Each structure stands twice: as C-alpha cells, then as structure tokens.
Nucleic acid binder design. Sequence first.
DNA 1: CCAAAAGAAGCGGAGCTTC
Length: 1095
Amino acid sequence: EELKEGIDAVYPSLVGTADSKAEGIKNYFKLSFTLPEEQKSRTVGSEAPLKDVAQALSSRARYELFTEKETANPAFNGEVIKRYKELMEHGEGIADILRSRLAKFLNTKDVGKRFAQGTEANRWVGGKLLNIVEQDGDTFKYNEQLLQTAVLAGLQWRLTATSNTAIKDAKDVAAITGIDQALLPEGLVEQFDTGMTLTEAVSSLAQKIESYWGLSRNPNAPLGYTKGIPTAMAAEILAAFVESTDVVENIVDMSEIDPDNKKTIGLYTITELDSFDPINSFPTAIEEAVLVNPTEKMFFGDDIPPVANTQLRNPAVRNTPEQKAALKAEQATEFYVHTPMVQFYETLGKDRILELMGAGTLNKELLNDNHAKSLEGKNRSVEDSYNQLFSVIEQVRAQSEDISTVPIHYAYNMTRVGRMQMLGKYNPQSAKLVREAILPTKATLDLSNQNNEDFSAFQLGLAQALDIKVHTMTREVMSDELTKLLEGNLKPAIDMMVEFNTTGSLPENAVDVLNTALGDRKSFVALMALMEYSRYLVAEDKSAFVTPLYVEADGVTNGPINAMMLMTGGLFTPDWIRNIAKGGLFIGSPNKTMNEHRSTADNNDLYQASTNALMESLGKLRSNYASNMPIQSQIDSLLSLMDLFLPDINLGENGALELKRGIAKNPLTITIYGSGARGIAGKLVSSVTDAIYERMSDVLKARAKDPNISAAMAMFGKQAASEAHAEELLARFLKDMETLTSTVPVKRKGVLELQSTGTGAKGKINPKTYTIKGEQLKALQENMLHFFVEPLRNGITQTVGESLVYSTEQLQKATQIQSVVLEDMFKQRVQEKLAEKAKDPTWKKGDFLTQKELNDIQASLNNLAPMIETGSQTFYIAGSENAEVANQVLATNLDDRMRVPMSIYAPAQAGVAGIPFMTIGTGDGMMMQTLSTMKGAPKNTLKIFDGMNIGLNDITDASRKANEAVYTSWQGNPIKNVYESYAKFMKNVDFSKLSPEALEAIGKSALEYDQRENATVDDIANAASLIERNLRNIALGVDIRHKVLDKVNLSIDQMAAVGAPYQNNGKIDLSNMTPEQQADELNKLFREELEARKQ
DNA sequence: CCAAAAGAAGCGGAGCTTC
Ligand SMILES: Nc1nc2c(ncn2[C@@H]2O[C@H](COP(=O)(O)OP(=O)(O)OP(=O)(O)O)[C@@H](O)[C@H]2O)c(=O)[nH]1
Ligand SMILES: Nc1nc2c(ncn2[C@@H]2O[C@H](COP(=O)(O)OP(=O)(O)OP(=O)(O)O)[C@@H](O)[C@H]2O)c(=O)[nH]1
Ligand SMILES: O=P([O-])(O)O
Ligand SMILES: [Mg+2]
C-alpha cells in the first residue's frame, strides 16, 4: 500500500490533502487514482504532454523513438505529419479555451475565493475539476500534465468518435425522445442517428481521457470521483469543442413534435474533415503514441488482435474457453483488398455510387418533404461507407506496393446474445460496400471448361449475387437461369465491364447501363458478380482464374426454425414435421437437400406458410361479420390501400387476395421474440406511408415534366393501363384514406365495433407538404391492428405451434421474475449502504459507493443465479447500465450545463429479452461458435450471424460443416439452462423482502389479471414455483425429443445454397413414411424413453 | 421484440422546478 507516496510524487502540487479524514480541502484525484504496476500511458510524468507528443509526431524517427519501437506505420508520411502539426496547434487552442473557462468559473460568484477560504467546491457536481488544479497566487490553474493529456484524448476522440458510434434505429430514438415508436416523425430517426446524445458523447470522451491519464482506480474510492473527475473533464472538453466549432450542439424541442412532450434533448455532431484530408489515411497516430497498448488501430500482416476476456459491455460475464477459441479463430482470418472492385468504386466515383446505390442528387421541389428526409438518410449511409472504405484503402496502400497482398485482421467480441460481432461500423461484416472490397475468400479456379465443378461453383456464386434464389432450385436449373440472365438483360452491363477490365474506363452513362440491366437485382454484391464474370471473360489463363467471389451458406428462416427445434417440448405432430422440413430438417430422406425440397416437395417456406394461414384467418374474421357492411367495407379499404402501395399484397380483378412471404417475415420472427401486435401494426403502417410519400414525389416529378396532366395520371399512370383505370385507382386511394382515418375498430367484449375518430383526413392534397399526422397515423394503426395483424398472429401460432408459444411464454416469465428480484435486491442493498454512509463524516451526498462496495453487492446476488450457463456459453439477461440506481448527476461542465447522469452497472428488468437472448444465443450464436472451433473448421470465411461467406473452392465441405454445426446446436436445451438458473433462484429468493414495486411486477408475470389485485406474498411465491415446475417439464420434453431424433435418419440442410446436407446417420430408418407415420413412430420412441426415466 | 444507455437549465452548491 505504497500507492499514496507514488501518486503524490507525480502530482505534489494539486490542491488539498490526500486524506479522506482530513478537515480542510481534500484532493479526490489523488484519493481516487493510483499508479499502475506496468506503464499504460507514455504521457505519465510529462511536464508538457502536448509539447512532447507534438515533437513525437514531428518526424518518423522521433515517433519511433518516443514509442520505443523500431519502425512506425508507413502511412505516417510527410503529408500526414504536416496535418498532425496543424492538429497539435489546434490542441493548444482547445487547452487555451479550457484555461479561460476555468478562470471564468473561479471568478463567477466568488467561487475561487470561497474555495481558497475552505468551501469544499471540489465535491460539487460542477467543481470536481478543482481536484486537478494547483494554487497560483491569489487564484488557481490546471495541472498541465492532466490538462494537456486530456486534450490529446479530446483530439483522438474528435478524429475517430463518429466511426465508433452505435447505430440508432426507431426503437433507440423512441427511448431517447419519449415519443412512441409508431408516431415518430419522418427524418427524426435520421436527425438522431447522425448525432450523439450528451451521455453518448461524454461517456466515450471520458473513457478516452481516463485511458490517456493512464492511472488505475482505487477500489476503495467513491465512484463520484473515480468516474466523476474524467467525466467532468470530458464535459469541459465537449464545451470547448462547441466553442471551437469542432462539435455542433443542437437542442431538439420535443414539443414541436408532440405538444405534451416537455423534453429538450441535446444532439452533438462532430464537424467532418474533408474525405481527402491526409489525416484520414492514418487517424490514430496520437492513440498509438500515447498508449502502450492502443485500442484504436488497424491490424496488418502478422499483427493480430488480442482475445477479449469479457462479453461486450458486460464486465461481469467472462467469455468461456469455447467462446475465446472462436474469437481467436475469427481474428486469425486474413482479409485482402480486391483491387478491381476498389478501382471500379474509384472510377464510378462517390457521386455516381450515390446515384446508383443511394438517391443521387436531390432537388427539394420535386420531392415530398417526408420522402426527401428518407432519401437523405439513404445517401448518408452510402457516403459514410464509401469515405470509410477509401480511408482504409489509403492506409493499406502505404503498407506495400501491391495492396492485394497486405493481410488485414479484425477484432471481434462476443455480444450479450452470443454473436461474434466484428468491431467497428464500416467493416466487411457490417457494411455491404466494404464487404465487396475487403474479403477473406479466395480461390484459384479451373474455368477453362464450363462442365467443371469449378465453373459450377463459379455459377452458384454469380447466381446468388444476382438475386437468383439458389437454395430453391438445383444447381443444374440454377445454371440455366444464370446463363439466360447473363446472355439477356445483363449483357450490356457485362460488355461495359469487359471494356473496363480492358481500358480502365467507364462511359458517361455507366449508372444508366447498370440501373437498366440489374433492375431490382441491384446491390453491391451484384456489382461484384458483373465485375468477376467480366474479369473471367478477358482472363488470359482461364485454367487458373483467381477470384474472391463467394457463396453464402445462409440460414433458412433461421431464428424461428431454431426456436421450433430448440424449445418445442411435447410429443411430435405431423404439422411440426412438415413445418420443420421447410427449414431443412428432413426425416427419412437420405441426402435430401433444400434445393430438392423446394423444387419437388414443398415450395412454401415458413413465412409463406404463415401467410397462407393469415389468408385463412382473414376469411374467418370476414365471416363473423358478413352481415356488417360497415365492417366489411373497413376491411376492404385496409386491403385496398395495402394493395395500392405494397409489393407483397395483391388483389385480382375479381377480388382474389394474394400474399407473398415478405409481409410475414418480420412479424413472425419478432412475435416469437415477444413483440406486441401494436408494434407490428405501426411498422406495417410505416411501410405503407413511406410508399405514399414516395408516390407523392412521383407526382411532382410528373407535374414538372407535364403541367397539363391529371392527378390520376400523375399518381397512378405507371400503375394502371388506361386513364380511366388510373382514375379508379385514385378514387380508391381517397376513399381508403378517408375511411381509415375517420373510423377505427375497437374491441368491445370480444366483438369488433367501429368508432368515429372525429379527426378524419380531408382537403386538397399538396404533394410537397403532404404528411399523415399522429392522430391519423393512430387510426391507420388501429385498422391495421384488428383487420390484418391480429389475423396474422393467429396464423403465426398455427405455423410455429402452440407448444413453442407456451415454451417462450414460460421462458419470458421465469427470466422476467428473476430479473425483477435481482434489480430490486441490488437497489435495496445499495440503499442500505447509503444509509450507512450517511453516518460517515468523510462521506458526502453525491459521492456514491466504492467499486468494492458495488462488487460486494453484485456478488451477494450470486445465490439467485443471475447467470445462465450452457456449458459453452454464458448469458446474463438482467445485466444493464442505467441511471436509476444512483439517481443523481455525476458531473456538469463549468457553465452548470451538460449534466451527465450517474450510470451504474446493475441488473434491470428483462421484459421479453429472455426469448431472443436464448434463441439467438443457442441458435445461430452456438452454430457459428461451433463452426469456428469444430474439428476441420472452415477457413477463410466471413461469418455474418446466420450465414457464412465461403470461397468457391470450399463450398461443399464448408456447407456440410455448417449443417453439422446446426445439428450440434440442436442438441442444446435453453429451457433446461433457464430452468437450472431459476431452480437455484427459487430456493434462495425471499419474496417478503421485495418492495411493493417489485412485488407488483412479478404479479404481472406470475399471475392472471384478476389476481394482481389483493395478491399476498405467499400467493406470488406459490405462482413463481409453478413456473419452475413448468420449465422442468418442458426441459424434460426437449431432452427426450432431441435423443429420439438422433436415433432416426436425418438430413440437415438449414444452411442452404450449395446442396451439401449433413447426415446424422441415425440407424432407425423412417423412409417411405408419411409425416403422420413418422410422428407415430417418434412418439413410440418418446414413450419408450419416458418409461426409461421411470426406471 | 433483441443485439448499449440516452432532457435541459436557474438557482445554489442538492434537487426542485418550469418548459
Ligand atoms: N430480435 C430480432 N431478430 C432478428 C430480426 N431480424 C432478423 N433477426 C434475427 O436474425 C436471423 C436471420 O435474419 P435473416 O437472415 O434476415 O432472416 P431469416 O429469419 O433467416 O429469413 P430468410 O433468410 O429470409 O429465410 C433471424 O431469424 C432472427 O433470429 C429482428 O428484427 N429482431
Ligand atoms: N438480432 C437481430 N439481428 C439482425 C437484425 N437485422 C439483421 N440481423 C442479422 O444481421 C445480418 C445482417 O447481414 P446483412 O447481409 O448486412 O443484411 P442486413 O443488414 O440485415 O440488410 P438486408 O440485406 O436488408 O437483410 C442478417 O442476416 C441477420 O442475421 C435485427 O434487427 N436484430
Ligand atoms: O439466394 P439464397 O437462396 O442463398 O438466399
Ligand atoms: Mg437467413
């Protein structure tokens, strides 16, 4: 414990006494931090970090000598050095702003004088920065080591923070704003996704600062200072960045949107550097100069990422030995630049790739206001992905003369749901544009003869990339489909690419050529296929054609099939057997493939099946209201409007309804994962309205080209044959929009009744300003809910089976109840420690608990079994970081603003998170982990969760391994895993100790609505133990089913495309049997095994 | 549904209050 002497030697002039018991001003920086046993930062001990690092960055030799290494990144050249010189000068400006801000803070309200007289301003939420000041005559000034080091972190953050931010979707923006997801204005998600919230900006900034400070937290110090001082610094640096215009602050007024929303929300956007700014080619020189082990860097050649010890954002969950092996294997993979695609991207140029793959140049007078904002979002994502690719290409290009021989490695970590996520936002795994330029897939193929197996593999790669559904047809039929396409519609695009692969040039009309040839086949991988096929055509040696073109072994309706296999817990039914075959589990058909299944046996997949069931359920709803003309008319109107704008809905001339797989895909999936119907309804309406806003632009684009054209032949000309036919379409639209906004269905005692809203749509349409408002969106949603979504939900249950629904409900309940108790106990143990600290004279309110105190509390919850263990994976469903534990500001800036709430790592309610956690985890997550670690694991692949990109040389073996990995994951029992955790929970829980809040929440999950009223502790305890029994019985069933199935002859082709199914070689032959016969025999084996447990 | 949370600011020195 010589840590007091150590840190005082480094900072002896900081104000106050490094004794928490001392009576005057106490220094909480020295009380909170210690020197690390091994150096973490090269700026520790430096009198002037900004001067030292600026000299370090002034030349290659100085950089190498400062980093104590023989050779620096070759990207650090003359042009990049000059840019860092200017950036170091800017750091001096930031530091100068910070010093002036401190001076003003000390002068305002005589704070400096009071602090000098003994007022403990260094313990205030806005004064924790006084812990790193030094006395300077009659005033105070920053410690220069600490100030300048924080500024260096500020500069690194400024350069790379945007590229490390998370992606905000509709759910995120809803959580941030307090506006219900379904009523979110258009472009609001775009506004919020492009910016950072305060917590988002400050916490990432604070993380950097503390990292560069290079010290270690004292476990016995209050989090109010260990987390508070760097956050205080981060907040002042953000404020300085706003003054300097490096960051823009936008306070978004929610009452402009929703008048009863009082929230005003800060949004921080970093000012973008030029795409051609040399600093982009090497944006981490500071990071790599300051830190002994840099986080932010690219991994070239034999420089490989280390293996993460803990789950992403779950410090309490250690990656298992099997997970770590998976991570090592994926980080070992070498990725390479495919030069022809980069050259193609470069030659088209940013502007043309925007025109082709985004929305091109937008003129804000032929575009609907709402549609214009969606198109701005489409352009942004493509643009950022392009710039990020070429920044990476600049760095790669410096490493060698031939860029295609520089190996690239990527860091991965295991997420909470057991997925191996590639770190970063613009890597091969996450960005489609990058995925076609940087690849691990490689093959040398003999394409000199089109009857080769090599040429067939090549064809499969091409067909899949061009939107041919390769898993639905045999290789032979596939081959003819591709040939027709290549020799037909794609031919003029192919001729252009031939010419590009000869001269390096593209014609002025390149975008038109590609757009016309590809149609709705257009994608980045489609461009890769045209590039690769044209390369083969001009290839000197077709006998040894080298290509990164891949085939994706892709999961067929993966999550739902996984759920059906992993969590169905009773006897076998013939419907289950038929429905699971749609996902590639074949019983009694040796060597059967998904290609064969879809072409000869059953052309309907699981989502098509559920759509078929929706059609049946819709008829049944129609018949219950046959005499009710207003009701029949509402239904007709909802269907009409959907038909008018959505591709997956069709109505024939005599009113025959046709539905495609695509409308059931997401609803089915997210229903299993616990979504409500309202959320599904809102999403279907969003897709309708987006199409309407898009059509409004098509109208303006018609009125400009032709002023004397009718609104009927402006909105429905491309959709209808004649003008009268376009007039009947327009009449339908106005009829539908009026009735669907003015009238809503309401469920009154199990009956549907129509009610007037009093807020129906009327008035002349102005295509530019046209917006379907919140009250009118609500009405469309309620119509969608009762007339489409509810029937879809009935259809969904029929398809996946009631037994699975029952299993997922029990899983949800157990995990929610357990999470409620963990949350509440933690909060109580925290409240009990704070009442104890209230007696401590050294302790002040605002100081929280120490890390050791929080670790003690977290470890005291272990007998409630917060972790689910599978033997190869660990899940912690309750785990979160939230502001509700400390319920207090952590730090503010020196203007009393940027008040960051204190966030704590603690358990919180799961809600429905247990279902997707366990299904994704033990489904696709376990499959991929197995695939990474299994005997003869496929090499040189890219894994994207439920599909794996494979080099053309290894498509057969890798697919068969992938299907084997699927079978392996189907030997799991997530309910058993949940049961084992919940059973331990149940012997240690004391429901009496819980708060009325916690008790109420458990009541909702464990009890029927008519029993939450007067529920005793003993009532909800008996109800909780009944769920334990239910879990036990389900887990037993799943266990038997899996054993029974292993004895039968099985062909597995869930990871489809190639036609390489895994054979389990089960010795009981169920060939030449109907599903009814198979179910009867499996059930005989079930009972046989069930009677074995009896004895 | 899930894969990461997330109002601002005056006055005063925490936490209530107004927008
Ligand atoms: N919780 C959640 N999971 C999703 C969602 N979308 C996709 N997933 C998961 O990712 C899996 C694979 O996604 P996809 O390949 O796009 O869809 P799929 O279910 O395999 O269906 P197809 O490939 O079209 O046959 C799904 O089965 C889900 O488990 C979603 O919106 N919510
Ligand atoms: N849990 C979860 N997984 C998702 C969700 N959406 C997509 N995924 C998974 O992530 C993968 C993304 O791979 P991409 O090839 O980039 O496809 P995408 O990002 O979904 O874009 P699309 O081509 O429209 O499917 C999908 O195949 C799914 O496996 C989601 O909402 N929740
Ligand atoms: O094009 P698919 O059949 O691999 O999805
Ligand atoms: Mg899939």
